[PDB]
PDB file of C-alpha atoms in Angstrom:
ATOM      1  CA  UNK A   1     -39.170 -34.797  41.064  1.00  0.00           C
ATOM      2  CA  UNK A   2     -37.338 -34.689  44.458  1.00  0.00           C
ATOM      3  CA  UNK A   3     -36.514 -31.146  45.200  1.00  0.00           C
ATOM      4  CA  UNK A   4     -32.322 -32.320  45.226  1.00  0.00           C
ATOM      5  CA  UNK A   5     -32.367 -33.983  42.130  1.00  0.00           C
ATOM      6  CA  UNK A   6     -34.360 -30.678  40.549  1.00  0.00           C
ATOM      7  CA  UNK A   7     -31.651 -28.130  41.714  1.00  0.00           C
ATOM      8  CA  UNK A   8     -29.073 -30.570  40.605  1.00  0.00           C
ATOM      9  CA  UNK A   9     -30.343 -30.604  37.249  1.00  0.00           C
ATOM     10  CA  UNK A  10     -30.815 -26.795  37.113  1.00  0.00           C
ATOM     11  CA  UNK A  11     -26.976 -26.311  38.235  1.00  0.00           C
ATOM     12  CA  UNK A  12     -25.830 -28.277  35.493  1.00  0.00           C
ATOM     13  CA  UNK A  13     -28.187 -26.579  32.692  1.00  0.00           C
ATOM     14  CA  UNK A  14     -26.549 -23.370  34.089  1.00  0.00           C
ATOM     15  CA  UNK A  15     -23.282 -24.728  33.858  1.00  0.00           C
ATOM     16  CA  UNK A  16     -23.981 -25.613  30.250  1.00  0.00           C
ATOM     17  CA  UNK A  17     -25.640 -22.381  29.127  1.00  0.00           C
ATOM     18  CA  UNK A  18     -22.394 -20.764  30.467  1.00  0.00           C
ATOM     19  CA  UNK A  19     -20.096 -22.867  28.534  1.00  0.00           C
ATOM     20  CA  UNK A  20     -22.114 -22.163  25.441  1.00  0.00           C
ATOM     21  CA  UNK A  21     -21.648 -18.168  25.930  1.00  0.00           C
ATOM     22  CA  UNK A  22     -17.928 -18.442  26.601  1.00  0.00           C
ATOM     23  CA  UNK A  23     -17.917 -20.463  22.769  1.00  0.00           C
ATOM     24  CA  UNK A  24     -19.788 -17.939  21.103  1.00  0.00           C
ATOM     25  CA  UNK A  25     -17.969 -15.057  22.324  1.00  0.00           C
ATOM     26  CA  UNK A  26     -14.343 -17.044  21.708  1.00  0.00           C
ATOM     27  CA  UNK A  27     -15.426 -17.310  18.488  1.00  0.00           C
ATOM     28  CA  UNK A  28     -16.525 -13.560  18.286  1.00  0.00           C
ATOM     29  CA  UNK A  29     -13.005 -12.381  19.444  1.00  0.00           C
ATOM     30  CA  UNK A  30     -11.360 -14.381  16.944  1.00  0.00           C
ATOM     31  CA  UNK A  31     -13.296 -12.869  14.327  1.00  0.00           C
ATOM     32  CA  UNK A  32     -12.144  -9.628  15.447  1.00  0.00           C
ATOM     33  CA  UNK A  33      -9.003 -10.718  15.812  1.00  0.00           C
ATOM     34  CA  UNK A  34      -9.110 -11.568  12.370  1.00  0.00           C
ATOM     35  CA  UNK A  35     -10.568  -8.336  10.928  1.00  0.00           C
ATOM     36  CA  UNK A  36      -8.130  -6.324  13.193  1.00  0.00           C
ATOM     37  CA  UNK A  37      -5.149  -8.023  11.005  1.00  0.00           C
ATOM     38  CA  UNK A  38      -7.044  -6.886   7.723  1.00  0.00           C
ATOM     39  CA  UNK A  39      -7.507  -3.261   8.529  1.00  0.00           C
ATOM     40  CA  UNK A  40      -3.975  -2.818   9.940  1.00  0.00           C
ATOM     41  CA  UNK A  41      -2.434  -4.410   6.392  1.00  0.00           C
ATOM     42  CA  UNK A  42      -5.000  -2.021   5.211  1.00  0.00           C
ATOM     43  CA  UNK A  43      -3.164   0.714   7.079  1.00  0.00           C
ATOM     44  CA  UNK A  44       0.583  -0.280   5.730  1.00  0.00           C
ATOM     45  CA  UNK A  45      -0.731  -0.440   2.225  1.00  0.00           C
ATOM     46  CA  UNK A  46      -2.402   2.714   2.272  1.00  0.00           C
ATOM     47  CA  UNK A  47       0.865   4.634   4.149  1.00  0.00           C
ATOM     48  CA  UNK A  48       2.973   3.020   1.288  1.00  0.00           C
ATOM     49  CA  UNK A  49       0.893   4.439  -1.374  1.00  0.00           C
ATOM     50  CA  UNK A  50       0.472   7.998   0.457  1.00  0.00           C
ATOM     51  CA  UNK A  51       4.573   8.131   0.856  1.00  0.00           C
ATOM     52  CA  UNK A  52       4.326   7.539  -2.720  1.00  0.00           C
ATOM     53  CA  UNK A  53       2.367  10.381  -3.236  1.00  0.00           C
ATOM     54  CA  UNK A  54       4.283  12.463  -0.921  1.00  0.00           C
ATOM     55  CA  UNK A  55       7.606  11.460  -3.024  1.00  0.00           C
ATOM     56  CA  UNK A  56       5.994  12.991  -6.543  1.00  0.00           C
ATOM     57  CA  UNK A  57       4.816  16.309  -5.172  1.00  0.00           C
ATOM     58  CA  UNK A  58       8.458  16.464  -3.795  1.00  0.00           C
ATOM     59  CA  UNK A  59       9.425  15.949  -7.683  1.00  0.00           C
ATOM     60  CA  UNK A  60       7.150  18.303  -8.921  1.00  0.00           C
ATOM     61  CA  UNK A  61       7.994  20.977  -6.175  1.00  0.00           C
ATOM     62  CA  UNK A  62      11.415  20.499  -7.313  1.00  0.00           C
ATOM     63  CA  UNK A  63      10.636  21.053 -11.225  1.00  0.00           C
ATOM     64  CA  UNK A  64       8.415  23.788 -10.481  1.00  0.00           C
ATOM     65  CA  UNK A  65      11.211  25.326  -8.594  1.00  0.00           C
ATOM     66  CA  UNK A  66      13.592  24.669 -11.577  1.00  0.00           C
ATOM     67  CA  UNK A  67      10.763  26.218 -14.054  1.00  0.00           C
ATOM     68  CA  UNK A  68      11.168  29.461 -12.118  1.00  0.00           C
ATOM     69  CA  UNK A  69      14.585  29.471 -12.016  1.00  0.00           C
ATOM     70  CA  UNK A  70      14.804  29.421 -15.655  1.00  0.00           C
ATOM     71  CA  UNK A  71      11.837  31.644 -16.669  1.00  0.00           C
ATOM     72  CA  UNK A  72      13.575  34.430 -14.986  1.00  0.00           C
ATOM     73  CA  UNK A  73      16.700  33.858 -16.943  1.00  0.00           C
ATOM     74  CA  UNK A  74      14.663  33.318 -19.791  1.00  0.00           C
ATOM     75  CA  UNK A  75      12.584  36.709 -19.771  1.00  0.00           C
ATOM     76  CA  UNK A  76      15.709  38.563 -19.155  1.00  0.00           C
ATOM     77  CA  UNK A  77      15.482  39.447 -22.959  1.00  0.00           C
ATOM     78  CA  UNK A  78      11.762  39.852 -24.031  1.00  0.00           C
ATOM     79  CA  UNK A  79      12.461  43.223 -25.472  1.00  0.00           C
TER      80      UNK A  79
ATOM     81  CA  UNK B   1     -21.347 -34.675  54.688  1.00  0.00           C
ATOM     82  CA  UNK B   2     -23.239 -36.903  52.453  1.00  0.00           C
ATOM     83  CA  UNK B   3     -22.361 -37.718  49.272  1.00  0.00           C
ATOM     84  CA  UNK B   4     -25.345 -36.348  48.046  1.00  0.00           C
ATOM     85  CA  UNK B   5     -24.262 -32.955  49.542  1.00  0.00           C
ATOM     86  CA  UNK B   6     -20.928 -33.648  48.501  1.00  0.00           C
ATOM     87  CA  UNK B   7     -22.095 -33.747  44.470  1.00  0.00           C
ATOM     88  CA  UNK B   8     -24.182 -30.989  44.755  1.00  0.00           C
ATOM     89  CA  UNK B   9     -20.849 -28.614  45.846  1.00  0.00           C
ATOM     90  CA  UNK B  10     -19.251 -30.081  43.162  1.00  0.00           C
ATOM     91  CA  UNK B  11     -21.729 -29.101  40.684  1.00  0.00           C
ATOM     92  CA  UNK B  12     -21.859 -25.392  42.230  1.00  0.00           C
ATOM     93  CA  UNK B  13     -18.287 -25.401  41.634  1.00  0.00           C
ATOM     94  CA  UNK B  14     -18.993 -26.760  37.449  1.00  0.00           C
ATOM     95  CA  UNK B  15     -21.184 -23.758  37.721  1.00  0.00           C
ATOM     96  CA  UNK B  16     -18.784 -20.972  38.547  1.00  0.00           C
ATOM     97  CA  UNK B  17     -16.173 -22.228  36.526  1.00  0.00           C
ATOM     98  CA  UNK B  18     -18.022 -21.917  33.351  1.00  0.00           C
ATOM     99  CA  UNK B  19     -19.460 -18.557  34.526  1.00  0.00           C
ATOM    100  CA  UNK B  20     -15.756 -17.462  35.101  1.00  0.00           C
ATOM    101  CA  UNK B  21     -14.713 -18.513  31.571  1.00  0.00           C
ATOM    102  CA  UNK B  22     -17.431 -16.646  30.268  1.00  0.00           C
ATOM    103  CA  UNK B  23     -17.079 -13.459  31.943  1.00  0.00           C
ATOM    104  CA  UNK B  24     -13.532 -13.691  30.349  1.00  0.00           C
ATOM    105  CA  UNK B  25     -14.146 -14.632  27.039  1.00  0.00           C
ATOM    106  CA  UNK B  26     -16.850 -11.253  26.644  1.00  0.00           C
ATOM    107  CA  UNK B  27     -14.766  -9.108  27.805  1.00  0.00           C
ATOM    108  CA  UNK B  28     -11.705 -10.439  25.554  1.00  0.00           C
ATOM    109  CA  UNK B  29     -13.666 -10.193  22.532  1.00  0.00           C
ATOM    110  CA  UNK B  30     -14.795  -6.429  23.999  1.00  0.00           C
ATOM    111  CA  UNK B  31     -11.339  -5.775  24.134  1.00  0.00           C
ATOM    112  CA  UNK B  32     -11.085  -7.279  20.648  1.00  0.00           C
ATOM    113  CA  UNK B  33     -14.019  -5.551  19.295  1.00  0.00           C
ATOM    114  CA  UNK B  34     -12.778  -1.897  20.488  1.00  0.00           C
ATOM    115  CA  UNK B  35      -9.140  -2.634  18.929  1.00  0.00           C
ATOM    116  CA  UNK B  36     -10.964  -3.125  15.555  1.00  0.00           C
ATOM    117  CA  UNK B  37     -12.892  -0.069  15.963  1.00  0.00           C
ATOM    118  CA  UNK B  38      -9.690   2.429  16.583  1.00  0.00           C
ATOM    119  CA  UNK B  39      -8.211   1.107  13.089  1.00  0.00           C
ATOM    120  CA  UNK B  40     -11.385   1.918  11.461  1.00  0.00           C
ATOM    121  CA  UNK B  41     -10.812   5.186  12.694  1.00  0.00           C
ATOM    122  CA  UNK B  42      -7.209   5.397  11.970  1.00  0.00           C
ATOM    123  CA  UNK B  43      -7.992   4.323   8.697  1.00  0.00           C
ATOM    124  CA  UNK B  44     -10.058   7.240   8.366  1.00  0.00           C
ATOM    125  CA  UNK B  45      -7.725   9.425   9.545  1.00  0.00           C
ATOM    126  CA  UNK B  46      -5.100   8.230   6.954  1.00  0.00           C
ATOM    127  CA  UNK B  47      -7.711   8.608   3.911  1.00  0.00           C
ATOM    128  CA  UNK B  48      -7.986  11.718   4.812  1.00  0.00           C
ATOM    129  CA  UNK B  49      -4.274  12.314   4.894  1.00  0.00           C
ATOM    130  CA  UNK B  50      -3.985  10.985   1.390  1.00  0.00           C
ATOM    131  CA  UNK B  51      -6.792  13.206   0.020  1.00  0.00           C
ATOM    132  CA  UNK B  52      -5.376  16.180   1.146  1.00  0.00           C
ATOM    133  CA  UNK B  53      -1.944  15.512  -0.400  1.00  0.00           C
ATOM    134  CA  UNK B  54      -3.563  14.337  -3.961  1.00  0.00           C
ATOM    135  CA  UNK B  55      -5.144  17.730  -4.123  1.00  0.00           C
ATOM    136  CA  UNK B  56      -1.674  19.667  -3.340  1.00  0.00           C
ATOM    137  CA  UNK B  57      -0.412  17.203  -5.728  1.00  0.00           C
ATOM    138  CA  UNK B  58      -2.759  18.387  -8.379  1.00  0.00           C
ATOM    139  CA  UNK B  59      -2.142  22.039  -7.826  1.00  0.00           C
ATOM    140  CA  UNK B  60       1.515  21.370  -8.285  1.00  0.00           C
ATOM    141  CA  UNK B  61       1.088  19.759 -11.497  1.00  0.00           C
ATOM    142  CA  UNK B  62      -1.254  22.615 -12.861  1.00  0.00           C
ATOM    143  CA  UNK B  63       1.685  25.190 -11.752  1.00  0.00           C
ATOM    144  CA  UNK B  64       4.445  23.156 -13.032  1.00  0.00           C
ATOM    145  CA  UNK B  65       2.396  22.835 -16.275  1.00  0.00           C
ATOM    146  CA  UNK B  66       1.284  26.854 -16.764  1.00  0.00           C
ATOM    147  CA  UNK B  67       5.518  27.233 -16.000  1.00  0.00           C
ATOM    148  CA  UNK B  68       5.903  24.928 -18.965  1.00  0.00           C
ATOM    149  CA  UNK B  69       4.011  26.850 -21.061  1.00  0.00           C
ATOM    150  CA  UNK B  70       5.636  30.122 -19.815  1.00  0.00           C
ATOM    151  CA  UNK B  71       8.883  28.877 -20.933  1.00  0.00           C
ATOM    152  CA  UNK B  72       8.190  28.011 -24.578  1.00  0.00           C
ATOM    153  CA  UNK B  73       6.546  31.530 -25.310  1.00  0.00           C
ATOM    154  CA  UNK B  74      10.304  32.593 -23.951  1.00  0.00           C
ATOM    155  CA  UNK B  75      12.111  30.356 -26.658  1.00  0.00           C
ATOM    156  CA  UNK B  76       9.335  31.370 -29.229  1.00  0.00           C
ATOM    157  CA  UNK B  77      10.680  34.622 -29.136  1.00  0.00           C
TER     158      UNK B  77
END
């Protein structure tokens, strides 16, 4: 093959192996992209449920604290 | 020029164009890629969070329950 025609035809298969890796890795961000908006809904559902948690040890403080309070009234008279 | 010259620029330029748009797209889904990493961590992070306040959760409840039974040997007096 003339030596033109034969670097033409290498410049355009590099020009389509390029195009090919800026497709694959589009579609690799977009996965990420993806699995990035999982793990943070992840995140809100799991704060929610921990400020849950956080709420009922404030109620139990709170009855522990009222326990105590009345066990000391209570004991006044064990004799 | 000839024309034959003339194509062959044109095809150099087809060339760095694409290589342009790659180099972009790898390091967008880097960037991507990294940002999906930190959550994993932060996820971690808040697990962890959680664990430790179910277990002072639990000790409250154990206290609060021994208090309990406190009180009704008072009024079983």
């Amino acid at each position: 093959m003339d030596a033109i025609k034969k670097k033409m035809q290498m410049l355009k298969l590099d020009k389509e192996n390029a195009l090919d890796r800026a497709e694959q890795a589009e579609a690799d961000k977009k996965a990420a992209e993806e699995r990035s908006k999982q793990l943070e809904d992840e995140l809100v559902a799991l704060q929610k449920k921990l400020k849950g948690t956080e709420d009922e040890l404030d109620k139990y403080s709170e009855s522990l604290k009222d326990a105590q309070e009345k066990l000391e009234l209570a004991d006044k008279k064990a004799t």
